Amino acid sequence: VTIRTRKVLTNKLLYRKQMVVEVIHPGRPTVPKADIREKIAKLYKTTPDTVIPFGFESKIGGGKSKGFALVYDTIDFAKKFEPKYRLVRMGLATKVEKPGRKQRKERKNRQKKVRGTAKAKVS
Amino acid sequence: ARLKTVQSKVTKSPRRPFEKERLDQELKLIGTFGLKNKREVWRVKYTLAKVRKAARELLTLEDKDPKRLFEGNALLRRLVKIGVLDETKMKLDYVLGLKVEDFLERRLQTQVFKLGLAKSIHHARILIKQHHIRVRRQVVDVPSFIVRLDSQKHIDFSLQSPYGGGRPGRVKRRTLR
Amino acid sequence: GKPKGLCTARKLKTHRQEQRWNDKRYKKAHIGTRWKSNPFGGASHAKGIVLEKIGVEAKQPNSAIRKCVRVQLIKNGKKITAFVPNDGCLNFVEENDEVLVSGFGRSGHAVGDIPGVRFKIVKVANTSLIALFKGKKERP
Amino acid sequence: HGSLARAGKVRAQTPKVDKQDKKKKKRGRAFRRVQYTRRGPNSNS
RNA sequence: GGUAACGGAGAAUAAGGGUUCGACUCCGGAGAGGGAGCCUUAGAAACGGCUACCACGUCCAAGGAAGGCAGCAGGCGCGAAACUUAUCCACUGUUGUAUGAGAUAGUGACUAAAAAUAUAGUUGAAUACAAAUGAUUCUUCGAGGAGAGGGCAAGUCUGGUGCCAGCAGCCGCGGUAAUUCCAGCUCUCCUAGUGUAUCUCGUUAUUGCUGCGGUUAAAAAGCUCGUAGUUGGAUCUAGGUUUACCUUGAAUAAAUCAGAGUGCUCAAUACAAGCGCUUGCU
RNA sequence: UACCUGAUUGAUUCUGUCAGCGCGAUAUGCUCAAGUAAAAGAUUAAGCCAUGCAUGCGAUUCAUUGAAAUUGCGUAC
Numbered sequence: 001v002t003i004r005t006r007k008v009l010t011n012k013l014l015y016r017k018q019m020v021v022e023v024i025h026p027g028r029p030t031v032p033k034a035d036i037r038e039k040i041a042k043l044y045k046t047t048p049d050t051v052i053p054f055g056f057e058s059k060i061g062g063g064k065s066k067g068f069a070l071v072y073d074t075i076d077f078a079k080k081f082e083p084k085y086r087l088v089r090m091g092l093a094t095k096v097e098k099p100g101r102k103q104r105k106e107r108k109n110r111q112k113k114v115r116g117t118a119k120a121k122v123s
Numbered sequence: 124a125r126l127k128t129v130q131s132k133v134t135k136s137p138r139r140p141f142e143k144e145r146l147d148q149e150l151k152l153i154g155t156f157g158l159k160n161k162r163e164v165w166r167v168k169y170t171l172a173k174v175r176k177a178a179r180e181l182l183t184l185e186d187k188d189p190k191r192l193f194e195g196n197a198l199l200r201r202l203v204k205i206g207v208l209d210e211t212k213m214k215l216d217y218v219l220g221l222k223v224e225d226f227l228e229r230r231l232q233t234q235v236f237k238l239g240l241a242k243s244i245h246h247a248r249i250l251i252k253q254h255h256i257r258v259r260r261q262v263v264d265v266p267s268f269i270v271r272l273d274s275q276k277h278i279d280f281s282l283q284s285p286y287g288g289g290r291p292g293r294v295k296r297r298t299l300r
Numbered sequence: 301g302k303p304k305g306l307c308t309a310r311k312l313k314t315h316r317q318e319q320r321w322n323d324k325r326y327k328k329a330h331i332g333t334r335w336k337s338n339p340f341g342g343a344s345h346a347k348g349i350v351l352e353k354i355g356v357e358a359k360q361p362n363s364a365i366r367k368c369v370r371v372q373l374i375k376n377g378k379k380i381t382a383f384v385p386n387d388g389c390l391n392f393v394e395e396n397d398e399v400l401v402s403g404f405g406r407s408g409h410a411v412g413d414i415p416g417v418r419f420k421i422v423k424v425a426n427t428s429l430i431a432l433f434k435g436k437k438e439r440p
Numbered sequence: 441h442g443s444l445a446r447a448g449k450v451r452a453q454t455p456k457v458d459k460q461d462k463k464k465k466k467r468g469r470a471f472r473r474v475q476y477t478r479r480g481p482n483s484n485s
Numbered sequence: 486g487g488u489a490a491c492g493g494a495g496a497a498u499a500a501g502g503g504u505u506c507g508a509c510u511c512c513g514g515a516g517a518g519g520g521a522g523c524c525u526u527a528g529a530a531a532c533g534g535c536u537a538c539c540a541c542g543u544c545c546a547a548g549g550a551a552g553g554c555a556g557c558a559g560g561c562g563c564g565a566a567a568c569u570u571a572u573c574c575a576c577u578g579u580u581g582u583a584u585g586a587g588a589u590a591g592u593g594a595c596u597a598a599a600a601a602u603a604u605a606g607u608u609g610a611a612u613a614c615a616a617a618u619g620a621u622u623c624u625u626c627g628a629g630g631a632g633a634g635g636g637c638a639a640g641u642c643u644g645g646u647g648c649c650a651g652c653a654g655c656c657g658c659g660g661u662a663a664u665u666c667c668a669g670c671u672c673u674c675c676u677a678g679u680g681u682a683u684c685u686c687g688u689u690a691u692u693g694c695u696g697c698g699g700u701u702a703a704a705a706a707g708c709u710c711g712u713a714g715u716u717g718g719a720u721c722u723a724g725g726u727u728u729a730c731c732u733u734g735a736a737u738a739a740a741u742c743a744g745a746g747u748g749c750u751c752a753a754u755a756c757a758a759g760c761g762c763u764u765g766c767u
Numbered sequence: 768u769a770c771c772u773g774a775u776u777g778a779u780u781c782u783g784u785c786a787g788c789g790c791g792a793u794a795u796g797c798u799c800a801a802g803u804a805a806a807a808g809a810u811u812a813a814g815c816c817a818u819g820c821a822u823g824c825g826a827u828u829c830a831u832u833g834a835a836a837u838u839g840c841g842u843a844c
Contacts, residue, residue: 128805297627
């Protein structure tokens with residue numbers, strides 16, 4: 001389960017680092033992203049929650065695999081420049097339960113028909 | 124919105140569907156190099172004919188033409204790196220001498236049984252299909268896969284195959300259990 | 301002989317266009333009444349209803365009665381005669397039946413010893429006539 | 441002569457016969473190999 | 486006057502010269518059921534803005550009030566002919582939470598590339614994603630289409646019918662001893678594809694500019710004059726002002742066609758990528 | 768790959784077409800182990816549409832963070 005990093009760019013104006021991470025697990029299945037995260041954190045002597053492996057696709061027959069990684073200066077910048085879904089995936093943030101777009105669009109369409117403060121009441 | 128995806132054909136059907144000479148010759152070629160269908164050989168014939176027609180179009184021009192130089196050197200280079208054209212034969216006036224057998228020999232399916240990795244060409248094909256061959260640490264399951272000169276010497280058994288080192292096959296596991 | 305002057309392009313082109321109309325293929329494809337005269341209206345297939353069934357005396361020296369069916373196209377209501385291929389397939393065609401019909405092969409010309417018949421049935425009652433002959437299916 | 445009512449006469453008169461069973465012929469490369477090894481082809485008389 | 490006509494970039498075929506097409510992802514134009522008239526505005530004769538008429542609908546308590554999917558998804562019709570009344574701004578842009586633009590999944594033998602039947606699936610894991618499915622890793626178990634007289638590759642084998650049934654693009658088979666039908670048995674082509682129908686191009690020097698033919702096969706006007714058109718004799722520095730034409734440059738959106746490099750496993754494709762070592766170079 | 772082949776005759780050579788033959792478009796028959804890209808109500812009816820969506824977001828906050836409303840902007844892309 002050797003990890004290697006290439007193409008490293010330090011994004012101070014995004015307070016992180018961007019690389020390409022390659023994991024070698026011949027015979028074994030694809031690496032768990034948590035294990036990749038731990039190995040990258042040990043490599044870069046920084047917190048394991050401030051490292052983001054993503055887009056990890058494996059090659060045929062096991063062995064080689066490639067997926068990108070974002071190592072962040074601080075958790076503030078991590079959950080400052082990032083989409084919510086990644087933070088939900090790794091547990092940093094949480095998913096917000098929201099109605100489907102069909103239902104929400106119907107709600108707003110009916111809310112259009114009604115004027116004043118009854119817009120909130122109608123549902 | 125979305126664009127037109129770019130496609131291109133590689134096989135051109137013969138003008139005469141039936142003639143004993145071509146039929147027998149192509150059957151003999153299929154036998155010599157294990158292929159699946161006549162489209163396989165027409166693909167090689169049409170690649171060869173593209174090569175030859177481009178070379179002829181080039182030779183219609185004189186020797187030191189910039190386009191002639193670039194294209195001829197590139198084409199001789201590609202054929203060399205595949206291992207079809209001879210590396211002491213550097214000219215299009217000589218590339219106008221090739222045959223389908225040359226390209227067909229540069230298929231993985233041939234090299235497998237050639238270098239002793241399989242007994243028959245059929246055995247070679249079924250081994251590649253079952254993922255028991257590897258190339259430069261790369262399990263290629265494509266019999267028509269094209270083996271360059273460099274990769275010519277970089278094929279051995281798969282690092283996971285029971286025959287290349289790994290768990291016993293299904294029959295062996297059944298017997299053990 | 302044809303004109304050969306360096307400034308006779310108009311004459312050459314006009315003469316060629318004028319003489320193209322004396323060509324059967326060009327005239328057939330550019331006449332303008334093709335759609336009105338052709339039962340299928342330029343299509344390859346059509347649908348219709350059966351009216352009656354006929355036997356046509358095959359031309360000399362052949363002796364046989366070819367079993368065709370008179371059909372009415374749904375697109376335009378025109379009456380045509382369509383051939384029913386394979387043996388004992390007229391049985392699978394009953395009066396007042398929906399049929400898919402196609403060309404016979406010679407692009408509006410009769411084929412073989414069947415006189416005046418230029419279409420052929422490809423499906424009856426939404427079934428393939430070949431399937432009906434081969435027993436792969438049965439009359440709905 | 442022809443009467444338009446004798447349809448299916450020959451296939452109706454045709455004596456009915458059954459089929460025979462044969463080992464599933466080899467498919468694809470095996471068929472090509474078998475044909476090559478076997479190499480008029482159907483000289484009955 | 487006609488067009489079963491939006492123009493172009495282009496597409497198919499293709500020695501050369503061409504023939505045909507181009508509703509359609511880009512550019513320009515037009516339209517929002519058919520007309521007409523306008524408000525607002527920088528910009529509209531706007532229609533997911535209004536006003537009126539015509540055609541056709543919708544709700545009414547009959548006093549009234551409304552509608553414009555040639556936007557996305559679906560429905561009816563028309564037909565030979567064409568998909569889910571799905572999820573999302575996670576990606577690509579719009580000034581940016583909003584975006585049926587846009588991006589995801591569904592049906593899909595349009596199609597392009599790559600490939601199992603000999604020597605697939607399945608259980609649960611690991612990956613991906615806005616969520617997902619399916620792809621990429623481990624582990625449990627665990628052959629069909631046409632054909633077989635010639636054109637054209639491939640049977641004068643067996644029984645029935647006796648020009649009937651049928652086959653057959655064409656020539657042609659079948660009339661009581663059928664290599665062509667109906668069966669049965671056999672083989673050939675191609676191959677997870679292979680037939681059929683209509684149409685385009687080649688074949689076609691059977692539209693001929695290159696490049697046809699006109700005594701008898703189709704084709705020289707009965708003959709002459711004649712305007713337009715077409716075509717027009719030789720001749721100006723060999724020696725010891727205008728044009729036409731040819732050469733080279735300028736201005737000439739991409740996508741496609743031709744064309745370098747690069748193992749996305751190959752290829753269609755795509756425009757990637759490839760080395761050190763971590764704070765990197767090309 | 769600058770290509771032809773069958774058919775008028777007792778037989779022959781021509782003219783000439785018909786047929787065959789290769790590609791492509793559309794439809795359709797039979798059949799189809801799994802996967803990757805991927806066209807897709809143009810052709811006829813610019814025919815008619817149930818139902819859902821497709822255009823909404825700085826100044827003005829005594830409602831409970833920001834609702835409602837007025838402006839501004841856009842909806843001519």
